[PDB]
Design a protein around this ligand. Structure first.
Ligand code: NA
Lengths: 506, 77
């Protein structure tokens, strides 16, 4: 009942022969997905000495990955989404940290396993289409029913950026996620007729919304493939899409390529944005394109289980509540509580760092070391510290003001500047390298300043960085300078260099 | 051997490739900077500049992997 996979069962009971997934021109019904997840999880549990605590899903987005997610939950394990396009080192660190003892892998996933399992040779490997132990898949080995779980069982492991390059692992319990979907189940009105976008990559918290708002309701998630973005009206109309969820970036993209011409997106009933500052001017173009749609801004870090706020766009309210042409994030989820900590570590009635407690709070990372500075003890309760400065209005509407620290958001990608700096020490022909976030029309862009006898080809930076960093976080701006400036206490001056970055880009 | 228009256009989306270094028939476009945003913009630009339409059939996982495949796909329209 608190079980994530129970939401897929709710859909199965409601809409067995309706689509649960449309992807690459293929349809997977709830019945088809159920029977395959029972087979795969049965076969897997047959092949492992113990029920695995953590199952890696090492596949591109698609049907093999969705079946893999269900298989992991059904086996009573934590889902650990892995990206075949990530550098092997990053993927290996995620599998290590998450204690992954079994991998569900597509074609592309399987090519990486010789390297990834080099000395995890134990690992069970289920093919979704000589290191590792090949799982024999047979309907004879099927579970008849999915394994039950307790609220404190880890349902998902997701990684956020770390200051030493090593990513922080967030275990989300079935209980964490059940509190989330109780709030969303009550707020929204999804039915088995709805068709939801699946724009979020499966290593990101917001993909849970796409999959489990859909599946909980008997709806379908659909592929929004790269080419749809240059004719979104035709794609949304042909496929009868009724729920949009993406980053704000996609608004500017769709407008540039195909327009966001008013009345061009009539099929949409819900339009959701999360992961970057949402601009009022962008939201208004999207509302006028999708006039039958409610438009909502959703905010939250991985550590508070996907989203903790929601603001409904109204041309009459949002710019009044909001500041600087940015749409507000909205009031805290019912059943959560916040305290605002100012820059001195003291509570403030209406302005400071947002800290959150209640059943959506993870409460820890996989590695206890990551906990330091990320939790608060106040009023006899443990709060998570977002690093996000907010203002509170009477009636509870929250406005995002900026970051307290030196973490940045590049499109949706939350990254510590220290993560990029650590990777750059590896680089050749370079004296010193420092990464800054440059405020641009597009939000924030990584820029590297570096000393050297001569400029260093971007490809040389890229070659080193791609060995440990996902491409999302690999900068495209490299500026050779004679001298890097130092501050009061003789550390490189990132304030001065952020300003120089800004004046180079706009 | 693709035309100048094709290469000039493709180069605007490959920021880990200097102007003075040639574009190889099957360098990995990902490795010289093509991200998922550039891929969409690139698709749009090719359709507008060559007055062609990429059908969902011809848009495999491979189409935008290398210059040689993209040009083969494009000139076959
Ligand atoms: Na205002």
């Amino acid at each position: 009942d608190h079980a994530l996979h129970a939401r897929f069962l709710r859909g199965l009971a409601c809409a067995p022969d309706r689509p649960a997934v449309r992807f690459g021109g293929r349809t997977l019904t709830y019945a088809q997905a159920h029977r395959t997840a029972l087979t795969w999880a049965g076969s897997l549990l047959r092949a492992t000495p113990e029920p695995p605590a953590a199952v890696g899903v090492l596949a591109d987005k698609g049907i093999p990955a969705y079946l893999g997610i269900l298989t992991a939950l059904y086996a009573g394990a934590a889902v650990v989404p892995l990206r075949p396009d990530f550098p092997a080192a990053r993927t290996a660190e995620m599998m290590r940290a998450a204690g992954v003892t079994a991998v569900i892998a597509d074609g592309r996933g399987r090519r990486l396993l010789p390297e990834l399992l080099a000395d995890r040779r134990d690992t069970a490997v289920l093919a979704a289409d000589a290191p590792g132990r090949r799982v024999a898949i047979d309907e004879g080995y099927a579970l008849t029913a999915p394994r039950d779980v307790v609220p404190d069982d880890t349902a998902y492991v997701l990684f956020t950026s770390g200051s030493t390059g090593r990513p922080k692992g967030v275990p989300l319990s079935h209980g964490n996620i059940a509190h989330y979907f109780e709030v969303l189940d009550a707020r929204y009105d999804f039915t088995a007729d709805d068709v939801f976008t699946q724009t979020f990559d499966l290593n990101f918290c917001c993909s849970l919304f796409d999959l489990f708002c859909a599946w909980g309701a008997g709806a379908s998630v659909i592929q929004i493939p790269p080419q749809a973005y240059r004719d979104l009206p035709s794609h949304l109309a042909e496929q009868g899409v009724t729920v949009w969820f993406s980053t704000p970036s996609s608004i500017a993209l769709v407008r540039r390529l195909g327009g966001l011409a008013p009345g061009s997106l009539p099929t949409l009933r819900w339009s959701f944005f999360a992961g970057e500052a949402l601009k009022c001017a962008d939201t208004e173009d999207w509302q006028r394109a999708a006039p039958a749609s409610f438009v909502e801004n959703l905010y939250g870090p991985t550590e508070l289980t996907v989203t903790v706020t929601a603001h409904r766009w109204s041309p009459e309210v949002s710019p009044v509540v909001g500041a600087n042409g940015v749409v507000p994030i909205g009031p805290l989820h019912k059943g959560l509580d916040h305290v605002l900590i100012d820059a001195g570590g003291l509570p403030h009635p209406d302005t400071g760092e947002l800290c959150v407690t209640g059943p959506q709070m993870a409460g820890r990372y996989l590695d206890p070391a990551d906990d330091h500075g990320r939790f608060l003890d106040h009023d006899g309760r443990r709060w998570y510290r977002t690093g996000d400065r907010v203002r509170l209005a009477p009636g509870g509407e929250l406005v995002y003001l900026g970051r307290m620290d030196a973490q940045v958001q590049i499109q949706g990608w939350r990254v510590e500047l220290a993560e990029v700096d650590h990777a750059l020490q590896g680089c050749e022909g370079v004296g010193e390298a420092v990464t800054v976030g440059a405020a641009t029309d597009a939000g924030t862009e990584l820029v590297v300043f570096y000393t050297a006898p001569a400029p260093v080809p971007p490809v040389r930076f890229a070659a080193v960085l791609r060995a440990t960093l996902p491409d999302g976080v690999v900068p495209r701006h490299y500026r050779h300078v004679a001298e890097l400036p130092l501050n009061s206490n003789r550390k490189i001056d990132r304030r001065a260099l952020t300003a120089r970055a800004e004046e180079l880009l706009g | 051997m693709w035309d100048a228009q094709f290469e000039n256009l493709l180069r605007r989306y490959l920021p880990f490739l200097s102007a003075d270094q040639p574009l190889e028939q099957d360098i990995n476009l990902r490795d010289i900077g093509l991200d998922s945003l550039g891929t969409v913009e690139l698709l749009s630009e090719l359709e507008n500049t060559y007055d062609v339409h990429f059908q969902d059939e011809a848009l495999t996982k491979e189409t935008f992997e290398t210059p040689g495949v993209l040009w083969k796909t494009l000139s076959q329209m």
